[PDB]
């Protein structure tokens, strides 16, 4: 089974450098063409670079001379060296393997998010969201968590360590003042909470933040 995994993304200042990694396995490494593709905020995809079986590398005008793709055959690691970074470089970076003979991008990794900015790294604040005064309205209670004021992206959210998956809604972060804000909600049966625990697990890799906020009934 083909498997590609990216890493190394994070926050970097304008004009800076960064080297991304992509660990491959499941296929003979030096036989196929490996590439780097990126996706910007507007969800547009753009080829960044490729290195074919023979060794030749190829780049696009927007990046030639700043980005250098290379592969470590002994370790099955594909690299992408970035230098003289620009705000436009901000995006999700995917490594992919061709199907065969320069045909298609058959296998993609999960992608590592690279943010180019001068803004300072900032931990998110997680706030529990509990009803204010219980009364009527069916038999299902809705709860939430407000992940506010962090930078940069991304942020991970789960409920009860991933055990609570049904009826969950996690909204995309919104940027305002160099800071991001996101929320998530989970709907459970009234017969459960608060006697049964409901906790949101928020993770923000850039600042090494990992918080488990338990939803508790609001006081007076």
């Amino acid at each position: 089974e083909v498997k590609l995994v990216e890493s190394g993304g994070g926050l970097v200042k304008p004009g800076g450098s960064l080297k991304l990694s992509c660990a491959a396995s499941g296929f003979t490494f030096s036989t196929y063409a490996l590439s780097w593709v990126r996706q910007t905020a507007d969800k547009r995809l753009e080829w960044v670079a490729s290195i074919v079986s023979g060794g030749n590398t190829y780049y696009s005008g927007s990046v030639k001379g700043r980005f250098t793709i290379s592969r470590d055959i002994a370790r099955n690691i594909l690299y992408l060296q970035m230098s003289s970074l620009r705000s436009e470089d901000t995006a999700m970076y995917y490594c992919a393997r061709e199907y065969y003979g320069y045909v298609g991008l058959a296998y993609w990794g999960q992608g590592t998010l690279v943010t180019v900015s001068a803004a300072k790294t900032t931990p998110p604040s997680v706030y529990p969201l509990a009803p204010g005064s219980a009364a009527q309205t069916n038999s299902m209670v809705t709860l939430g968590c407000l992940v506010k004021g962090y930078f940069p992206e991304p942020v991970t959210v789960t409920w009860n360590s991933g055990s609570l998956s049904s009826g969950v809604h996690t909204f995309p972060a919104v940027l305002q003042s160099d800071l991001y804000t996101l929320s998530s909600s989970v709907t459970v049966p009234s017969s459960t909470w608060p006697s049964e625990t409901v906790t949101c697990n928020v993770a923000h890799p850039a600042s090494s933040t990992k918080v488990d906020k338990k939803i508790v009934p609001r006081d007076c």
Partner: protein, 219 residues
Amino acid sequence: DVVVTQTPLSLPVSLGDQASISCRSSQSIVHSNGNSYLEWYLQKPGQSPKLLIYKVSNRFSGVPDRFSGSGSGTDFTLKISRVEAEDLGVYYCFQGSHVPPTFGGGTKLEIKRADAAPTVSIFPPSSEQLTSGGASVVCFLNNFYPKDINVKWKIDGSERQNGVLNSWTDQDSKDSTYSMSSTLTLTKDEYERHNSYTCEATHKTSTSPIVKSFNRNEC
């Protein structure tokens, strides 16, 4: 640089119907070797793009026969027969005959379903936040269709126009609906100076807004 133009940017389709996406290159995609490296991809919300079709009409292992591709030179098409909910996401066509290889801007496939009113919930500021000297009132508008909806905030009767942030989730595969978050943020001081907080949802399914609110004097 072969500019690949994709249309529409968004395409509605009901379950079991057919949908077609158009992809056109500013130059021929036919290569010297006689091949045309035109491909199609699908990226579902929160996921990586996936290969569907390559060389105009060749289906990648795993892709259902419902997906067919065709065209030539500069005009290409992706047809999706008997549409299912799981087919939603953004489709992209790709050209690999000229370097640099390029992608089209993408087409978002929306699934049509019965109209559904949002399930609204309002939440007062958490103790922890108040302690920080801040106060955000959050309103969830869950599982609705169509996507267009408006949220109005009122503090003690008057609508509050500033300090609001809204966020729509992508269409959900399980029920073909959408969800939205509305957050009203003020300082702790200004918040403790008022009593009632309400958020009014204006959707197509009703001529009168759905309302949710809480009074601070209440517990």
